[PDB]
Amino acid sequence: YAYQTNASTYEYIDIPFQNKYSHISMLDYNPKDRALYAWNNGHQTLYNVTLFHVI
Amino acid sequence: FQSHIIIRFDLKTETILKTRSLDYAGYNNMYHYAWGGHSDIDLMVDENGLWAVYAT
Amino acid sequence: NRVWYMDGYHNNRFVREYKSMVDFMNTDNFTSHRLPHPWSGTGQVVYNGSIYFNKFQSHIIIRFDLKTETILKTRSLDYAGYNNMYHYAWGGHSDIDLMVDENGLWAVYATNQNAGNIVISKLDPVSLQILQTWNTSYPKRSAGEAFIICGTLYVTNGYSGGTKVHYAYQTNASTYEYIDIPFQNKYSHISMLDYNPKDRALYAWNNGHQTLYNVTLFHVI
Amino acid sequence: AFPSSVQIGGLFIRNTDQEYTAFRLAIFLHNTSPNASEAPFNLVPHVDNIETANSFAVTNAFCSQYSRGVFAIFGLYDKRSVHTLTSFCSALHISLITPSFPTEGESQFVLQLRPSLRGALLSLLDHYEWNCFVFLYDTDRGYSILQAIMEKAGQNGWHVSAICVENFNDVSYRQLLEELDRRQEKKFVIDCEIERLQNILEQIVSVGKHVKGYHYIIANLGFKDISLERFIHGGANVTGFQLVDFNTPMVTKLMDRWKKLDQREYPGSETPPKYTSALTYDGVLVMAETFRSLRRQKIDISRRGNAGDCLANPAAPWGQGIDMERTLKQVRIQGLTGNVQFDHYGRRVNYTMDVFELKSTGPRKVGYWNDMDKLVLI
Amino acid sequence: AFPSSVQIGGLFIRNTDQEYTAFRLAIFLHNTSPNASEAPFNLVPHVDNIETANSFAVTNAFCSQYSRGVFAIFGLYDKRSVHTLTSFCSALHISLITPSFPTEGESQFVLQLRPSLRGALLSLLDHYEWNCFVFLYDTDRGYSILQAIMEKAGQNGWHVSAICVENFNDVSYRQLLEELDRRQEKKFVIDCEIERLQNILEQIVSVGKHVKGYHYIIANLGFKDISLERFIHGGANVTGFQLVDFNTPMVTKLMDRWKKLDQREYPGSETPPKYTSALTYDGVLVMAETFRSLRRQKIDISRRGNAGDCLANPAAPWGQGIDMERTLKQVRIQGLTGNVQFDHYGRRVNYTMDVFELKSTGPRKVGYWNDMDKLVLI
Ligand SMILES: *[C@@H]1O[C@H](CO)[C@@H](O[C@@H]2O[C@H](CO)[C@@H](O)[C@H](O)[C@H]2NC(C)=O)[C@H](O)[C@H]1NC(C)=O
Ligand SMILES: *[C@@H]1O[C@H](CO)[C@@H](O[C@@H]2O[C@H](CO)[C@@H](O)[C@H](O)[C@H]2NC(C)=O)[C@H](O)[C@H]1NC(C)=O
Ligand SMILES: *[C@@H]1O[C@H](CO)[C@@H](O[C@@H]2O[C@H](CO)[C@@H](O)[C@H](O)[C@H]2NC(C)=O)[C@H](O)[C@H]1NC(C)=O
Ligand SMILES: *[C@@H]1O[C@H](CO)[C@@H](O[C@@H]2O[C@H](CO)[C@@H](O)[C@H](O)[C@H]2NC(C)=O)[C@H](O)[C@H]1NC(C)=O
Ligand SMILES: *[C@@H]1O[C@H](CO)[C@@H](O)[C@H](O)[C@H]1NC(C)=O
Ligand SMILES: *[C@@H]1O[C@H](CO)[C@@H](O)[C@H](O)[C@H]1NC(C)=O
Ligand SMILES: *[C@@H]1O[C@H](CO)[C@@H](O)[C@H](O)[C@H]1NC(C)=O
Ligand SMILES: *[C@@H]1O[C@H](CO)[C@@H](O)[C@H](O)[C@H]1NC(C)=O
Ligand SMILES: *[C@@H]1O[C@H](CO)[C@@H](O)[C@H](O)[C@H]1NC(C)=O
Ligand SMILES: [Ca+2]
Ligand SMILES: [Ca+2]
């Protein structure tokens, strides 16, 4: 799911990622590093985002 | 714990400043995630500032 | 916002000066300016206060003023084909194509040393001197048309029927990539397709009709 | 004083993306060779990718390449453009290395890479003891197979029901299959184009003749490039031919290089190469070999002055074209399709093909056909 | 003093994107309605997509929705979750509107929208005079069809070869089909899930039993949603049932909005609605109708004091739940599946289905089956 608060719209996407250790409890986005900090079944993992801008 | 109260705590001076109440929010496994575990309120930040995701 | 109009590809030397888009879409009144030499093909450009064109059956680029009506620079493109040897797929003496982008003035031609492949060059807008050249791997005789958005050359595959953007060359990284971006050829035969950065739009000539495309660009962060 | 860069021409037609990819890959591998003896020169391809080969764009492309000073032209043709290209190449002493369908009377500076499917089909027909069958054919590759089949039927008293399916649609295919099933005709030989063959197989499966009791002989040079999974499940007899051996060190090396290629820079690399791309690669290797051999004989090939108008009043041919033709016809190399060797007519000789039969596990090699040994079974 | 917002519950199953889309579309159409009589309140759905972990997850979702103060729950179930959900709904006096497979044992606070398929199947098997056939079934929807078939075979002397294909793979499917064809069995009745039925049909086409002479009866409520293309060309006899009539003004009125929906905002709208989605839409309409009827009865619905834990030591049923169930069993509406009306057991009564047959042009309406009129042909 995706919600744009600026336009107050919603869109069903299907971007996939990988639950390597089969359980996710925390998943947050950190601006400065542009990365997703995640807690995977008692382990600390990071994901990298891919943001695109259309003109 | 067991309340819809957002608390700001200093990690440098080790004191309390603000303890506010999230208006119309569930607590104690009322509106948790799919995995549960008392995740009714999720606090995050982004390039615009501080945001809270909950349910009403 | 004055548009510039040219008909023919062999011996015409008259350009039109419709002063406005409303004076071009409906009004059939125009000012006819003569050229010292006729052009070849549909590859010319109007940049700043002048027009860059090709001089008859030669590999010569001429800068002509559209206000003072004189010649300041007339140079020769180095190792560039002329007189229907490295044309597009539609022919018509389109051996040299001139375009502009946010970085400046570019010329797409072909070289005998580089087989018959498309070669890009950056030209000085004043002195018409070669600044830097880039080698691509797409033959010009099978291209049909090409256009530059900003430092990237997009090359079509055909001129009538199923037309699509087939080739892309990034001169900043000097890398090539085959893409599939269809665009609709409504009126069969196409002759000219150029890019305008101010309107960010593709101006095209489709079987005697003047057509506009609005492009979509994306940037990855 | 051999030139450091020899110029060759290339003429490609519609639906030739993978063959052009193989041509470009072979050009890459020849030019950037670490060996200093494999590439004593460079290959400069002047490429024309036309859409409609209608003997007029073909003539324009040939004249444009001839004006550029090319030595040999790697060209593809169809039934509407073979004669013009062959006549233009023979008149001006310009060699034409073609991977398209072989024709008869195509000597004088034409070298065909595709082996003939005439002897193998007859050697499979008489071994299977077929005397009453159907022949679904098209005329997009000539009339040699049909003429040979009719001659064999006349000389052996066979009953061949020859049907042309050039203008047959899907429901017409279904009606034809039902009509042939009414007359208890369960033995078929299909000699059509790849898309037409796939449509015929799809119609056969849809109407329900892919079961035991039906036999199909596929007249094609590639048997592993056609999907026959439902034919495997049904159990019908399917027999075909293969030209490129996938268990060959050269072919496996090509496959290793091919699976490491980018699809965005080398289109058509998402699938294993067909026999046409293999013939293109062998043709580029043959051109490199004959250019190296011309360098060995100290022949300075140079088309200076001869380049000009193709349709001149005095027909002026290339003075060194006959040497190029002789050196091209005297090659004998080993490559993707096995042994590449040509006779004095420009046709491939001692070529070996593998006959495959469809079984429950899948395709299964049952023997090989050789030009001098006929059919040999295992 | 009826509340302006009425809370309903929604429990959804794995692979339920399209039915949830239909539920959301019906909620949209009810909430934002120009008529003030069609929407005197606002439906508030509490939705849980659980990806069921059986009765544990079902009980957790039911307790979570029950604590929120829902009046009725629109939930789905499977063979591993029907009993616990029905018992929880009946014990706590919470109505359960389910478009899932019909059952018999549950008789309190359960409203099933899917009509039974035993009567139409028996009428078709006795009008076709079938006496020896093969019944391929699965136990993902109960044992009612198998029990009815065995009872009819015992009372009529039929020869039914009953095979459970729950743990069958494609290879085993092909072996079973070949074995059944060896025993000269050409009459089949298939009662399986949609994916299992599609796999069975694909295997049938693979072995080649889609030719004329083979008869298949599909025990499914949707016949036009099955990809039957090769069976048309082969000529096999296919007979099926359809619940929703696409030539109905209400159905085409919905289809006008369905083709105008956005895929990225309403996922699953890229395909025509199945019978499950139509039953979901009819169930939402039934909930709206019974809430309006409760409004007309001057019954102040509320769950202020009953909101709490499900597993309390004293059972605390909802006082007004019996009023909701009585009003729910008395509805008679017109919707996508036709006449929606229920008996005192909460089962479908007075419903009409269309029996279709596969011809050379496509599915042809042959007859219609009604609950009291049995099978009537045209
Ligand atoms: C487009 O043309 C204008 C004038 O026609 C150029 O302006 C000149 O700018 C240079 C330095 O910026 C001055 O020395 C000249 O005197 C200007 N010209 C005139 C007539 O005053 C402008 O630079 C041109 N644009 C580009 C990108 O070169
Ligand atoms: C564009 O390609 C041509 C041909 O491949 C290049 O010309 C060759 O340049 C190399 C130097 O890198 C010389 O060693 C060769 O002798 C040149 N070939 C001929 C036939 O003259 C040309 O340099 C390339 N241009 C650029 C900018 O890379
Ligand atoms: C048939 O073609 C084959 C090509 O493989 C020829 O076999 C080679 O013949 C040469 C002699 O001319 C030997 O040096 C090679 O070792 C042979 N290759 C092998 C055995 O793999 C064969 O000579 C040709 N036959 C005729 C009659 O021309
Ligand atoms: C079965 O459904 C039909 C409607 O399809 C019912 O016919 C309706 O009966 C009521 C009386 O109860 C009339 O007011 C309607 O006008 C009838 N509708 C028609 C004829 O289209 C029929 O009564 C139902 N039968 C049962 C036993 O419930
Ligand atoms: C397309 O571009 C032209 C250029 O002026 C202009 O009409 C407008 O920006 C666009 N028109 C559209 C998006 O309809
Ligand atoms: C390099 O060339 C020499 C002579 O042409 C040959 O003997 C050798 O096998 C070649 N090696 C490779 C790796 O191609
Ligand atoms: C199919 O091939 C087998 C041998 O593999 C042969 O025995 C059989 O007769 C063939 N069937 C037909 C119909 O030709
Ligand atoms: C809306 O529909 C209801 C039910 O048919 C009807 O009673 C009411 O009059 C309608 N309102 C309008 C404004 O048409
Ligand atoms: C097939 O269906 C048609 C139409 O119902 C019927 O007449 C025919 O007897 C059937 N054939 C078989 C073999 O069931
Ligand atoms: Ca989070
Ligand atoms: Ca252009």
Numbering used by the authors:
A (entry chain G): 426 to 480
B (entry chain G): 315 to 370
C (entry chain H): 260 to 480
D (entry chain B), E (entry chain D): 2 to 379
From the publication, what sentences describe this entry?
AMPA-type ionotropic glutamate receptors (AMPARs) are integral to fast excitatory synaptic transmission and have vital roles in synaptic plasticity, motor coordination, learning and memory. AMPARs are tetrameric assemblies composed of subunits GluA1 to GluA4 and exhibit a modular architecture comprising three layers: the extracellular N-terminal domain (ATD), the extracellular ligand-binding domain (LBD) and the transmembrane domain (TMD). Here, to determine the subunit composition, physiological architecture and gating mechanisms of CP-AMPARs, we visualize these receptors, immunoaffinity purified from rat cerebella, and resolve their structures using cryo-electron microscopy (cryo-EM). Our results indicate that the predominant assembly consists of GluA1 and GluA4 subunits, with the GluA4 subunit occupying the B and D positions, and auxiliary subunits, including transmembrane AMPAR regulatory proteins (TARPs) located at the B′ and D′ positions, and cornichon homologues (CNIHs) or TARPs located at the A′ and C′ positions.
Inspection of the density features in class 2 showed that this group of particles has a stable, Y-shaped ATD layer and a density feature protruding from the ‘top’ of the ATD that is neither a scFv nor a Fab fragment. To define the molecular identity of this density feature, we used mass spectrometry analysis, and found abundant counts for NOE1 (also known as olfactomedin 1 (OLFM1)) and noelin-3 (NOE3), an olfactomedin domain-containing secreted glycoprotein. Of note, the olfactomedin domains of NOE1 or NOE3 align exceptionally well with this density, enabling us to conclude that class 2 represents a noelin–AMPAR complex. To investigate the structure and composition of the NOE1–AMPAR complex, we performed focused refinement on the ATD layer, resulting in a 3.2 Å resolution map that enabled us to conclusively identify the subunit bound to NOE1 as GluA4. Consequently, the receptors in class 2 are A1A4A1A4 receptors, in which A4 occupies the B and D positions and A1 is located at the A and C positions. Notably, the NOE1 dimer binds in a twofold-symmetric manner at the ‘top’ of one AMPAR, with the olfactomedin domain interacting primarily with ATDs at the B and D positions, and only a few contacts to the ATDs at the A and C positions. Each NOE1 protomer interacts with one of the ATD dimers, involving an interface area of approximately 779 Å2. The majority of this interface occurs between the GluA4 subunit and NOE1, with each NOE1 protomer forming an interface area of around 595 Å2 with one GluA4 ATD and approximately 184 Å2 with one GluA1 ATD. Alanine substitutions of GluA4 residues (Y21A, R25A, H47A, D49A, N50A, S65A and R69A) whose side chains interact with NOE1 altered the elution time, further confirming their role in the GluA4–NOE1 interaction.
